[PDB]
């Protein structure tokens, strides 16, 4: 009994709700998308711009 | 006899249940459990003292 008990506070402690995490992991898949696509556009169109300007 | 040497040997047991039973190396009751808080609110002042009479 006592090991039931402390199993399951351990995992509690430890274990991954894989709920949450997959959760996470798909926000940081997003975020890491929204990013590659802001950056897409931030290298390159403010520093053409000049070339436009010339 | 053999009735009261059982009986001994289950007092035993108890005694040594009182003295075993800990949460990760927190004795619970053998009686130094006392009462303890927990802090189970956001803010300062949210508190549940749990009390393990030996």
């Known amino acids: 009994n006592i090991q039931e008990n402390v199993e399951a506070s351990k995992s509690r402690i430890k274990d991954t709700d894989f709920a949450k995490e997959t959760t996470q992991l798909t926000k940081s898949q997003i975020l890491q998308q929204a990013g590659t696509s802001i950056l897409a556009q931030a290298k390159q169109l403010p520093n053409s711009a000049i070339s436009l300007l010339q | ?54």
């Open chain 2, 1 to 54: 006899q053999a009735l009261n040497e059982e009986s001994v040997a289950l007092q035993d047991e108890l005694n040594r249940i009182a003295e075993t039973t800990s949460f990760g190396g927190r004795k619970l009751l053998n009686g130094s459990f006392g009462e303890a808080s927990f802090q189970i609110g956001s803010s300062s002042g949210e508190a549940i003292i749990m009390g393990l009479t030996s």
